[PDB]
Amino acid sequence: KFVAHAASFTIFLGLLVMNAADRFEGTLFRMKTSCFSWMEMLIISWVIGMIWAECKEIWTQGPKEYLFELWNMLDFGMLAIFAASFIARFMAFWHASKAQSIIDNVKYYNLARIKWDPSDPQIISEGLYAIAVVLSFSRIAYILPANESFGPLQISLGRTVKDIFKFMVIFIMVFVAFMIGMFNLYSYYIGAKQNEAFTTVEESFKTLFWAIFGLSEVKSVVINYNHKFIENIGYVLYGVYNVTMVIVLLNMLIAMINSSFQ
Amino acid sequence: MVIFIMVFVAFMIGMFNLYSYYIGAKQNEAFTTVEESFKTLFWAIFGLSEVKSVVINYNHKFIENIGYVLYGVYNVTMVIVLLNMLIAMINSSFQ
Ligand SMILES: CC(C)CCC[C@@H](C)[C@H]1CC[C@H]2[C@@H]3CC=C4C[C@@H](OC(=O)CCC(=O)O)CC[C@]4(C)[C@H]3CC[C@]12C
Ligand SMILES: CC(C)CCC[C@@H](C)[C@H]1CC[C@H]2[C@@H]3CC=C4C[C@@H](OC(=O)CCC(=O)O)CC[C@]4(C)[C@H]3CC[C@]12C
Ligand SMILES: CC(C)CCC[C@@H](C)[C@H]1CC[C@H]2[C@@H]3CC=C4C[C@@H](OC(=O)CCC(=O)O)CC[C@]4(C)[C@H]3CC[C@]12C
Ligand SMILES: CC(C)CCC[C@@H](C)[C@H]1CC[C@H]2[C@@H]3CC=C4C[C@@H](OC(=O)CCC(=O)O)CC[C@]4(C)[C@H]3CC[C@]12C
Ligand SMILES: CC(C)CCC[C@@H](C)[C@H]1CC[C@H]2[C@@H]3CC=C4C[C@@H](OC(=O)CCC(=O)O)CC[C@]4(C)[C@H]3CC[C@]12C
């Protein structure tokens, strides 16, 4: 049974890889794009089987017992997104089906990708399907514990994640502190800055998050105007943010080393 | 490296599926092909991959925001996996 279910999982991973095999090396009009290929048909069948397997699991285990395990929520989420992607794809298929059946209203579905609506179901389908594929690769956690060399690594990895989640409370508090502070400083200079950063709350969150991995430049503090007082305030707050973050990350690293030895 | 490979391949296929259609739309070729997606994610380990590899020129901000989340989740997952490797290797030296 373990080999049969592990072999089924490896086929589903193989289908996901080979689904985009046409564009591995490189890449009405919307009628062609909407249709499902034979690879897509198998993937839909696998997802339906996974949903039914989850339904039987929730039926016998009970809603309370099933919901208590947090990893089952992750496995339920990836199947919901996979169903979400395919229904959005079908909506784009049916809308193009009406347009082709007619042959103005039909004008939209002849357009190329550059002119698509931002909320096109085709766009939503591809965005969700990318998330589902990433999440579907996380079902290896049901097969890794069997192996005697990979099982200990998963157990050790789970302990690391739980410890990091403990320190995320302090990390969040410092993150939100500077995110609001930096946003209040640069909200007025929306068009003055060299690059949009700390201008909006979403943009301030994005800049400070990527600053953790050193992927945010220092020029996000610079302003084009002559107001060097506010720019110097930004340099201090951004500099204090990095010092505080490396201190918090250093404290987390040392405390996790202790936890391993204790 | 077994766990590291599994996480690497997970995002490599996921990011490629997201950005395969916007081959010419993106500011720089990254996550466009499987080879290009592998190259971008590998160099992201050493902080040598920019964040603008997620940005698209088109108005489709839904897919761009999906790319920001997946790329951000990838870095968090990688630093977690690298942190777990570092701590476990320190233990192995002392044991
Ligand atoms: C806690 C988990 C386990 C619940 C189940 C998974 C959800 C997180 C999934 C299931 C259905 C998904 C939704 C299905 C369809 C949509 C509509 C879609 O609408 C838009 O495109 C927003 C408009 C725009 O594009 O700007 C936004 C994503 C969303 C909410 C998806 C977000 C993720 C959802 C809620
Ligand atoms: C365990 C499983 C069975 C639960 C899965 C729940 C989904 C099947 C439901 C929940 C929310 C629904 C979604 C709510 C919003 C949308 C957005 C919609 O796209 C649009 O926003 C329309 C835009 C336009 O018409 O211009 C496509 C259908 C979809 C994904 C719906 C498809 C069906 C969804 C994903
Ligand atoms: C195909 C690409 C995109 C992903 C690369 C890894 C995958 C092929 C996945 C899918 C199936 C998985 C395999 C399914 C079968 C097995 C055998 C299994 O054997 C055991 O350790 C059990 C030993 C015992 O039975 O006592 C270990 C996990 C493993 C290697 C799994 C490892 C991860 C695999 C190879
Ligand atoms: C006791 C501590 C923990 C709380 C109080 C902190 C202050 C002592 C420090 C922290 C940040 C410092 C400020 C950061 C940078 C500036 C900008 C500076 O203005 C300029 O750079 C001049 C610009 C120009 O020349 O055009 C005036 C001092 C001030 C407010 C500093 C004054 C002293 C401050 C408020
Ligand atoms: C239970 C967990 C482990 C699995 C389910 C994960 C979801 C709860 C999260 C993960 C990534 C999230 C998505 C990442 C970012 C977006 C893009 C967002 O679309 C926009 O950014 C709007 C763009 C615009 O305004 O034009 C819609 C919500 C959504 C799908 C998020 C919905 C909630 C998601 C699916």
UniProtKB/Swiss-Prot annotation, chain B:
Superkingdom classification of source: Eukaryota
Entry comment describing in which tissues the protein is expressed: Expressed primarily in placenta, lung, spleen, ovary and small intestine. Expressed in podocytes and is a component of the glomerular slit diaphragm.
Compartment(s) where it occurs, according to its Swiss-Prot or TrEMBL record: Cell membrane
Positions on the Extracellular side per record topology: 21-69
TM region(s), chain numbering: 1-20, 70-90
Modifications after synthesis and translation: Phosphorylated by FYN, leading to an increase of TRPC6 channel activity.
Coiled-coil ranges from the UniProt annotation: none
Subunit organization: Homodimer; forms channel complex. Interacts with MX1 and RNF24.
Similarity-based family: Belongs to the transient receptor (TC 1.A.4) family. STrpC subfamily. TRPC6 sub-subfamily.
Role description: Forms a receptor-activated non-selective calcium permeant cation channel. Probably is operated by a phosphatidylinositol second messenger system activated by receptor tyrosine kinases or G-protein coupled receptors. Activated by diacylglycerol (DAG) in a membrane-delimited fashion, independently of protein kinase C. Seems not to be activated by intracellular calcium store depletion.
Clinical note on disease: Focal segmental glomerulosclerosis 2: A renal pathology defined by the presence of segmental sclerosis in glomeruli and resulting in proteinuria, reduced glomerular filtration rate and progressive decline in renal function. Renal insufficiency often progresses to end-stage renal disease, a highly morbid state requiring either dialysis therapy or kidney transplantation.
Protein name according to UniProt: Short transient receptor potential channel 6
The organism of origin for this protein: Homo sapiens
Biological classification of the source: Eukaryota, Metazoa, Chordata, Craniata, Vertebrata
Gene that this polypeptide is encoded by: TRPC6
Shown residues in whole-protein numbering: 638 to 732 of 931
